[PDB]
């Protein structure tokens, strides 16, 4: 015969053989190679997801979902359900009337962070061809106990690592999405300077004659304190 | 009046999923992706790994030359899928 050092291996399964393309093969069937973790069967051949005991692990791809209740509200404890163009935005109640618009730049910055995180998790593939057998037909004593212990300990360690990774990434996601909004708040405060004050809630209480052009100038970044300065009569 | 107001707000979804932070067991989020695959198609795909269906023969039985496995003679495989219905029809053999 011929004995070659090789990557071919053997698997014990009763599943049907079909016509398709899939990198990962497990005794139950072929499974997607995208998701970083799997809960089908420990036996694998090819670029298969790492096996963990957990059924569902949820990675957040969005900010905290805070509901909302005349008057308008801000980021302090309210979240606009109607905002659909962007994640973060400006609402206004000027003399012309109430209106709504969205800040594109901050939304895409936060989304880019989330995208990079996702890219670092989902894309990776672990290639493993020939391994030990975890399914034992008889009782063999010594050698069975050792190899069973090996796979059990490996599964447990990988499961803890997966839980740590998911929780850490989720916490970072939520903190980042909140921080982006807080950054928008501070930028707007700097731009307004003397002509505004935080009204407790996210709504900046601004005291100067603002048309729709004023709100537009705030968002695109041209509100000049000097032009509207004389309205400093606020205190008096 | 000459006093306007500008509020800074975020977006919310009517349909909220729940994830786990480091601290809080349950925290609501807008869109959550699932990192664990928990299903199977049901069929073993032939591409792109060469699969040889063992049918009625174990690999050792095909190696020996048990007549049912005459077809498997001189074959190259990447994954020999041994089957539970394996049976031998030849001299009783024990392999240390």
């Amino acid at each position, epitope marked *: 015969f011929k004995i070659r050092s090789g990557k071919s291996s053997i698997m014990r399964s009763d599943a049907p053989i079909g016509k398709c393309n899939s990198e990962c093969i497990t005794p139950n069937g072929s499974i997607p190679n995208d998701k970083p973790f799997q809960n089908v069967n420990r036996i694998t051949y090819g670029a298969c997801p790492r096996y963990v005991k957990q059924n569902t692990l949820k990675l957040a791809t*969005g900010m905290r979902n805070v509901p909302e209740k005349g008057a308008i509200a801000g980021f302090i404890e309210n979240g606009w359900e109607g905002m659909v163009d962007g994640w973060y935005g400006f609402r206004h109640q000027n003399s012309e009337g109430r209106g709504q618009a969205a800040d*594109l730049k901050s939304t*895409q910055a936060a*989304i880019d962070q989330i995208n990079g995180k996702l890219n670092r998790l989902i894309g*990776k593939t672990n290639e493993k061809f020939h391994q030990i057998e975890k399914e034992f037909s008889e009782v063999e004593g010594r050698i069975q106990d050792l190899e069973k212990y090996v796979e059990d300990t490996k599964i447990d360690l990988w499961s803890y690592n997966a839980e740590l990774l998911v929780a850490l990434e989720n916490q970072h996601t939520i903190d980042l999405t909140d921080s982006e909004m807080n950054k928008l708040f501070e930028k707007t405060k700097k731009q307004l300077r003397e002509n505004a004050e935080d009204m407790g809630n996210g709504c900046f209480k601004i005291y100067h004659k603002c048309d729709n052009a004023c709100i537009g100038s705030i968002r695109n970044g041209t509100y000049d304190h000097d032009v509207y300065r004389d309205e400093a009569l606020n205190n008096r | 009046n000459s006093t306007a107001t500008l509020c800074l707000g975020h977006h919310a979804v009517p349909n909220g999923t729940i994830v786990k932070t480091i601290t809080n067991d349950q925290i609501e989020v807008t869109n959550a*992706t699932e990192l664990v695959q928990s299903s199977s198609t049901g069929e073993i795909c032939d591409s792109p790994h060469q699969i040889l269906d063992g049918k009625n023969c174990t690999l050792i039985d095909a190696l020996l030359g048990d007549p049912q496995c005459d077809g498997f003679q001189n074959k190259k495989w990447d994954l020999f899928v041994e089957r539970s219905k394996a049976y031998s029809n030849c001299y009783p053999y024990d392999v240390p």
Partner: antibody
């Protein structure tokens, strides 16, 4: 359908400045970026820069960082590439393919690749 | 940068034969990036394989993509006259950047 229509062929004198236009139809313009890649005669495709329709952010190639300015116009879905200080090596065919999805989180790799391509505009620079 | 090297630079193959095109990465990259494009002479370049193995819409199923880490391959079966062209391979940097490939020419028929 999703379609990209470029500008017209141009002839320029060394040291001049050229502006190239790329127009998008069908898909929502603000969601995807526009990415410019050029092919010199007898040369492989060469990336130049990326402009976003959502954000104003631009990233340019190191070889043409100083000389390249890229702009976008929502009305009506028009992307402009301006190359200054033209040199003989800049003679090439310039393409404008659709880029990354700048509106939402991304899991399909389809948005992370250039998919719909324009016809291309030939710019020949010589005295 | 992440320079990409394309193996064999020119390939000659009669119609109706399988073909394998190689793209070798200087550094390891996730399978998410590294897509495969087609350029036909006098025509705008076309996208064949996006991601690593996914088939773009309207692309014949004969085209298949595969690979990991440093090595990525494009496999074409039942080679027809539509297929003969130049092929390119590219990826993405976190700050948008797209390094392309040298170019493999499928000049073919004997």
């Amino acid at each position: 359908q999703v379609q990209l229509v470029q500008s017209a062929p141009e002839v320029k004198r060394p040291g001049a400045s050229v502006r190239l236009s790329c127009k998008a139809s069908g898909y929502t313009f603000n969601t995807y970026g526009i990415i410019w890649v050029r092919q010199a005669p007898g040369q492989g495709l060469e990336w130049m820069g990326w402009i976003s329709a959502y954000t104003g952010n631009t990233n340019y190639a190191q070889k043409v960082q100083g000389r390249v300015t890229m702009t976008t116009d929502i009305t009506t879905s028009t992307a402009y590439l301006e190359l200054r200080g033209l040199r003989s090596d800049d003679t090439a065919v310039y393409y404008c393919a659709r880029g990354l999805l700048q509106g939402a989180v991304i899991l399909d790799s389809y948005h992370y690749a250039l998919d719909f391509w324009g016809q291309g505009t030939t710019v020949t620079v010589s005295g | 940068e992440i320079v990409l090297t394309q193996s064999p630079g020119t390939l000659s193959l009669s119609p109706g034969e399988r073909a394998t095109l190689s793209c070798r990465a200087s550094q390891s990259v996730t399978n998410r990036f590294i897509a495969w494009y087609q350029h036909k002479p006098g025509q705008s370049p076309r996208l064949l394989i996006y991601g690593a193995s996914s088939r773009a819409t309207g692309i014949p199923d004969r085209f298949s993509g595969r690979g990991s880490g440093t090595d990525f391959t494009l496999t074409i079966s039942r080679l027809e006259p539509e297929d003969f062209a130049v092929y390119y391979c590219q990826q993405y940097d976190t700050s948008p950047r797209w390094t392309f490939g040298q170019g493999t020419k499928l000049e073919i028929k004997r």
